[PDB]
Symmetry: C2
Subunit: 242 residues, 2 copies
Amino acid sequence: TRILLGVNIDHVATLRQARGTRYPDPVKAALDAEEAGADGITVHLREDRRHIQERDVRVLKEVLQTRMNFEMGVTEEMLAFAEEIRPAHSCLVPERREELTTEGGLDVAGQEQRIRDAVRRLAAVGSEVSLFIDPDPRQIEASARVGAPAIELHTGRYADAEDPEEQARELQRVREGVALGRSLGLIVNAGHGLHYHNVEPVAAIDGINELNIGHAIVAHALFVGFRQAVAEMKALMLAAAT
Amino acid sequence: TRILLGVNIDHVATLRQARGTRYPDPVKAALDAEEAGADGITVHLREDRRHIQERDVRVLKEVLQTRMNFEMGVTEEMLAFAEEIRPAHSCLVPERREELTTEGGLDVAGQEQRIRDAVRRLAAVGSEVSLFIDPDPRQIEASARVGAPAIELHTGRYADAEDPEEQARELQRVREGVALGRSLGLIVNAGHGLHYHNVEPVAAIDGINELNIGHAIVAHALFVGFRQAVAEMKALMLAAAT
């Protein structure tokens, strides 16, 4: 079927934590996003609790009309929490120096057994697990070995490209990443760093399943509202994927 | 005349610094705010550069259709910056431990001479200077002594009140604060911590000049957009003040 949009609401909480109030509620933003056509809601509970809190995830579990994509760093605390939450989707991301690559993706190749156990525990809970990795053939192949059904390609370097030539190279890496992943039977996602003026070439890639976009949508929502921001982003993706 | 709305755009930059992009641009929000009926734009350039940058203030100077309210801590580096920028309005706020009172306002009484010089220097540049103080008789009277034309009352405690009885007391402090200030010939402002569900009793206070509101407007803008968020807040204030 068509390309899918997952809306990450972390930076709604970024705004909330700035003053330590109860608003803006990331829960409300999540419900607005679904109402505006989001296919899923993505939430990242960090160990440092920078934005999203446990309260956020627990309430989301009770109110979501679609499905949760629970982003987490691989620790015992987060795994146990996820086993409680039972999210439909989950995504393992790097938060600590040891699990980080230079580009920013999860070093699955460096920690294969550790990731495999995490994938197994999450899958046993019914969660479809994704691994947030760089568009690196070596990380993609490792991701397939550890038994993850899906990967999300790090589109950061594509988004951070200064000259058009550099962006073309980085877009080509993502393109090659998708082709490789699907050849290994993986579901391939992306989304980091994407905004309303660079999303279309990524959404145009054949075989892309879901784009998980957060910050740019939240940023745009400041001007048009969350409902319109989500709808506009989805429409861009659908028109580009055609 | 009628009550005035100053829109503080600090936390648009908060959302920007989270990912270090150019979006969301506080400049765009400010221009949206003016277009939506804001009477002035408030911007706080901190020493630690937590959100707003030098870029923000300088661009605002070039694009504002109304007037800038430059919030700043009193330092030599910052006073000179203000003397170049020459904002129509300025507001002296606490940033360092020694100038903070327990309630959070600027300890004008403790540093009268230091503040007096700051007011004089800014006034010489044509700026209407405001002092961010607690709704305390001793700070209000000190502010009049140092020659500042205006004060802004810290409405944080009123906003932070847990039980209705506490809120009634804190509102009374603000009410008495306004009365005292105007008796000393001061322009009296407020706005900190105010949101769409507690602003009206404050806007209803006789003699209130301008409310400077930031975070709550930014938070609400996530759902309805900055233009509608600004307009909705102003209408509440106008209806309450009449």
